[PDB]
From a paper:
Given that [name]’ CA and Drt2 also encode p18-like domains and to understand if they had the same Dimer-1 properties as p18m, we expressed Drt2m and the equivalent residues in [name]’ CA-CTD (Gag coordinates M259-Q351) and determined their crystal structures. The asymmetric unit of wildtype and [name]’ CA-CTD (F323S) crystals both contain two monomers arranged through a single Dimer-1 interface and the Drt2m(SS) crystals contain four Drt2m(SS) monomers arranged as two dimer-pairs through Dimer-1 interfaces. Inspection of the structures reveals all helical domains with arrangements and packing resembling that of Dimer-1 observed in p18m and confirm that the F323S mutation does not alter interactions at the Dimer-1 interface. Taken together, these structures show that p18m, [name]’ CA-CTD and Drt2m collectively share the same Dimer-1 interface responsible for restriction in the Ty1c system. All residues forming this interface are conserved apart from determinant residues 266, 270 and 312 that are AVL in Ty1c Gag and p18m and VTF in both [name]’ Gag and Drt2m. By contrast, in Drt2m and [name]’ CA-CTD, it is the V266 sidechain on helix α1 that closely packs against F312 on helix α3 and because of the greater steric bulk of the V and F residues the distance between the V266 and F312 Cα atoms is increased to 6.8 Å. Concurrent with the increased spacing in the VTF interface of Drt2m and [name]’ CA-CTD, the side chain of the conserved residue R315 can adopt a rotamer that allows it to swing in and hydrogen bond with T270 which is not possible with V270 in p18m. We solved the crystal structures of Drt2m and the [name]’ CA-CTD and find a highly similar structure to p18m.
Numbering used by the authors:
A (entry chain A): 261 to 329, 331 to 351
B (entry chain B): 262 to 352
Write the structure that this text describes.
Amino acid sequence: SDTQEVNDITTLATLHYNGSTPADAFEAEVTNILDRLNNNGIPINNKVACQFIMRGLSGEYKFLRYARHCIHMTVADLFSDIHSMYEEQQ
Amino acid sequence: DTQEVNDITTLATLHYNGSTPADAFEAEVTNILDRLNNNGIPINNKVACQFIMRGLSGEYKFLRYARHRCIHMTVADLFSDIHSMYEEQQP
């Protein structure tokens, strides 16, 4: 709590996702972290946030990284794709 | 175009135990904090100090023990202590 920023940044920098947990829940936790960082004066823009998320994608989700080498893609757009892929894996 | 991600990753994974010059450590940490700021991500004194302290090992861990909740310590103050310790370690 004293170290909220450091912990949130660390989490953002070490994200891993390959569809082993629900896409919704992953999305919710990443949104929460991005929102809290912003509220604590550390602005993570769409590009930087997308890069942190993309770099943690493994399994089939790595192909989303390969596909979006996408100028002006939003977190929302990336999360849409992730959810789509997750739904297809069920 | 991944400069911010790289710089934040560096900041989050710092390591210093006196095996390299304190000056060089300080220079690289300053460089990263400056470049982040220039790329619209200012990192305040507290957060910067926490990242540096967390990376201290060997005898430098004792600086973290002494200062973990040292309210309103500056990066400059922390760097001073690290440099002092380094100078004392030199033969």
